[PDB]
Design a binder for this molecule. Sequence first.
Ligand SMILES: Cc1cc(CS(=O)(=O)c2ccccc2)cc(OCc2ccc(CN3CCC[C@@H]3CO)cc2)c1
Length: 351
Amino acid sequence: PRGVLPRPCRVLVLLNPRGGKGKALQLFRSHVQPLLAEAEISFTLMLTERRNHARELVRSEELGRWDALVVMSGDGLMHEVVNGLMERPDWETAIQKPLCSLPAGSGNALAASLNHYAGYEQVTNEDLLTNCTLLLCRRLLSPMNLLSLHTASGLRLFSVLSLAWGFIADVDLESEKYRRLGEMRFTLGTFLRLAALRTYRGRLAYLPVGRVGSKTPASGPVDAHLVPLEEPVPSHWTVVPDEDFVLVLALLHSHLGSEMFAAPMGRCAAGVMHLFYVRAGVSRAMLLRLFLAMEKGRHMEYECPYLVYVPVVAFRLEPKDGKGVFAVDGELMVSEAVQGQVHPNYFWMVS
Ligand SMILES: Cc1cc(CS(=O)(=O)c2ccccc2)cc(OCc2ccc(CN3CCC[C@@H]3CO)cc2)c1
């Protein structure tokens, strides 16, 4: 399925100005605006001031007046937007409002992925901003998967990009102290965490796409592959025997950053996400090799037996590692048992 924005069209631009090392508004004016004017895209800028501001704005927004919502930021702002749409009473129609991700200078994994799918070379910073803006100007829409998440505490959350636990989430946390470095904050965080490598105790189970296929089962949204966290996972799932991990990563897209091609095995099918995990026992040196190889998406060629990849429609993760974190679409939260189901072709993105 494909769709197209009308011409002219009218979009809302949600922009975080204290973001892009404080340059997002300037970049919008210099790199985005002239292209929108030429493509007959009129806009209104709405500025975000703090965490969840966008979530609460989109939750209460009159959506009928916009042809799309444009988010100019990192991955976190898009997370907030989609979560705002999904918590509305009219969520079933609100989630069908076309969305567009423009990177603001501190990176954006979703924008990098969309640039990749469109056939562009793996560019960064202003070049990436330009390409993603040209995709908006071209007006074509593609459906994206959405991961519906439930935690032991009853939290209900949606993920457009990733859920990370272990090493990756710890890097997301550590890297908040280094925002001045831009996207390289994640590389520094990786080295620091690698220097202090640890494993994390927990249990992982998943429902591979091969077992049931990606069609949504009849019982919202309804997550009919899930049973309650207080019950054992269903007998037809796969339970991983390992009790200790270096990391676990659910990933809906090809990239973890503009220069991190994490999932080179092809764009996800409708209703399917990538699941990666790294088993305990791997060396620091191999983990470094894998990290560096991820730039050109060559890390799977090592055939390291500690790195396992599987395409899934659902999963459950039960951390038993004491106080820790998850990163959901790069956003930090306290870790606890969690499970999720992928919904196919659930929203539209400019792409
Ligand atoms: C030592 C190491 C090794 C690897 C390469 S690996 O182990 O081959 C691999 C490949 C695919 C999926 C998972 C793991 C990946 C790695 O990634 C660290 C890292 C941490 C944060 C981010 C940026 N965040 C913020 C946006 C979303 C994303 C995850 O939350 C990127 C990379 C660290």
